Design a protein around this ligand. Sequence first.
Ligand SMILES: *[C@@H]1O[C@H](CO)[C@@H](O[C@@H]2O[C@H](CO)[C@@H](O[C@H]3O[C@H](CO)[C@@H](O[C@H]4O[C@H](CO)[C@@H](O)[C@H](O)[C@@H]4O)[C@H](O)[C@@H]3O)[C@H](O)[C@H]2NC(C)=O)[C@H](O)[C@H]1NC(C)=O
Ligand SMILES: *[C@H]1O[C@H](CO)[C@@H](O[C@@H]2O[C@H](CO)[C@@H](O[C@H]3O[C@H](CO)[C@@H](O)[C@H](O)[C@@H]3O)[C@H](O)[C@H]2NC(C)=O)[C@H](O)[C@H]1NC(C)=O
Ligand SMILES: CC(=O)N[C@@H]1[C@@H](O)[C@H](O[C@@H]2O[C@H](CO)[C@@H](O)[C@H](O)[C@H]2NC(C)=O)[C@@H](CO)O[C@H]1O
Ligand SMILES: *[C@@H]1O[C@H](CO)[C@@H](O[C@@H]2O[C@H](CO)[C@@H](O)[C@H](O)[C@H]2NC(C)=O)[C@H](O)[C@H]1NC(C)=O
Ligand SMILES: [Fe+3]
Ligand SMILES: [Zn+2]
Ligand SMILES: [Zn+2]
Length: 341
Amino acid sequence: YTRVVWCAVGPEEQKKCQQWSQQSGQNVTCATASTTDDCIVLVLKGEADALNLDGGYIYTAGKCGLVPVLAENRKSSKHSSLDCVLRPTEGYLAVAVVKKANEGLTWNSLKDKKSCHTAVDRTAGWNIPMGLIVNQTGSCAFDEFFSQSCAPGADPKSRLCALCAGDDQGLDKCVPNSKEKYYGYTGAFRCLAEDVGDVAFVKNDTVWENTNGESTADWAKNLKREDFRLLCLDGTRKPVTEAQSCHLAVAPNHAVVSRSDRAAHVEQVLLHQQALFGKNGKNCPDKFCLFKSETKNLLFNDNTECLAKLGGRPTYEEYLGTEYVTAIANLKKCSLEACAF
Ligand SMILES: *[C@@H]1O[C@H](CO)[C@@H](O[C@@H]2O[C@H](CO)[C@@H](O[C@H]3O[C@H](CO)[C@@H](O[C@H]4O[C@H](CO)[C@@H](O)[C@H](O)[C@@H]4O)[C@H](O)[C@@H]3O)[C@H](O)[C@H]2NC(C)=O)[C@H](O)[C@H]1NC(C)=O
Ligand SMILES: *[C@H]1O[C@H](CO)[C@@H](O[C@@H]2O[C@H](CO)[C@@H](O[C@H]3O[C@H](CO)[C@@H](O)[C@H](O)[C@@H]3O)[C@H](O)[C@H]2NC(C)=O)[C@H](O)[C@H]1NC(C)=O
Ligand SMILES: CC(=O)N[C@@H]1[C@@H](O)[C@H](O[C@@H]2O[C@H](CO)[C@@H](O)[C@H](O)[C@H]2NC(C)=O)[C@@H](CO)O[C@H]1O
Ligand SMILES: *[C@@H]1O[C@H](CO)[C@@H](O[C@@H]2O[C@H](CO)[C@@H](O)[C@H](O)[C@H]2NC(C)=O)[C@H](O)[C@H]1NC(C)=O
Ligand SMILES: [Fe+3]
Ligand SMILES: [Zn+2]
Ligand SMILES: [Zn+2]
């Protein structure tokens, strides 16, 4: 009965979750939904217990009463002897990437260009970019800013979905789950790498993890970092090595969320599950690895070293940080005391 129901988004996450379930002796079980928002609703209804979420969704879930439980922690040498599970998270760098060969494209010449986004409502792929754009154009017509985009989660017949490809069969065009070829960090970067779009809104890590042989995938095998550039807010272009000085914002790490009343049990099971299937996990390589899924970032980002305890039992607002929270609020006035469910 000490069982946690994980919510998987889309059929691919479901498959990994089932594998996890099996390997955990059903200590973790699986529920599936077609979108992250649907998964939030399952948790709210109590039909699922938890799932790991990007900051923009943490905001959505937070307004509905869901709370941060543990955060993804990427590999970072700082805070040196403290173990990963207890090290404070640093956040990731939201960037705008373009092809080096697309010379003369800068932050100041993005209007009417083609764009690639992880999904609507996500931090680096949407909230940070569109927030900055709305800020600068003075207008809410962010839907009319780029000429075409792939923004999974938007209206499939609109220009924001025009560049989306859907699945093998061309179904599910623009669905905000991994069935959409250009969904998420890797999909948005593949969207740029295949020259479907002019700019991709992703994170620093994505560029590195999908270039210079870091990915064996076919569209990525032959990609080289020098062939790419980051767009800085001051109108300059820089090599992908300069992300610490050329990003759009620092984003709060994706984190596990759950209903307040299940938070403690979820944390307990989670800590014990990673001990088994985490980075240096007991059954990890050997049986199952929670933080691997061939660059597809299923359930968790593939670069996660561990899920770390939070600092100061933070509310969702503290977790996200005041800067980011007001930026999201300021952006959502275009489409506070809420929960759109
Ligand atoms: C941008 O994101 C990047 C990826 O998330 C960050 O770069 C990564 O930086 C870390 C240290 O902060 C580095 O950790 C260590 O990884 C290896 C040891 O486990 C080690 O070297 C490698 O050997 C091979 C190279 O021929 C290669 O196959 C293997 O993947 C390793 O890279 C390395 O020396 C280091 O001690 C990661 O390796 C590195 N990631 C990659 C894939 O390059 C970067 O810091 C981020 N920048 C910002 C601004 O945040
Ligand atoms: C674009 O939209 C908004 C206006 O450009 C902006 O919201 C404003 O953000 C600033 C900075 O985060 C907040 O600033 C602070 O101002 C002073 C300190 O300089 C203090 O007195 C305040 O306590 C506060 O910390 C503003 O609160 C906020 N303005 C309001 C009230 O809406 C968004 O941040 C911009 N969007 C993006 C994505 O950057
Ligand atoms: C616990 C602590 O001292 N952290 C504060 C945070 O509440 C708060 O949010 C953090 O903002 C940073 C960049 O502005 C991000 O690096 C970080 O991801 C984010 N915190 C977390 C844990 O997600 C910031 C801003 O008010 O101040 C920190 O001092
Ligand atoms: C399912 O979770 C339960 C409870 O968290 C685990 O049961 C015990 O776990 C503790 C710590 O690992 C051990 O001291 C006990 O030996 C476990 N009980 C027994 C008799 O197995 C259990 O390990 C988990 N099950 C699986 C298959 O992973
Ligand atoms: Fe994110
Ligand atoms: Zn910065
Ligand atoms: Zn607090």
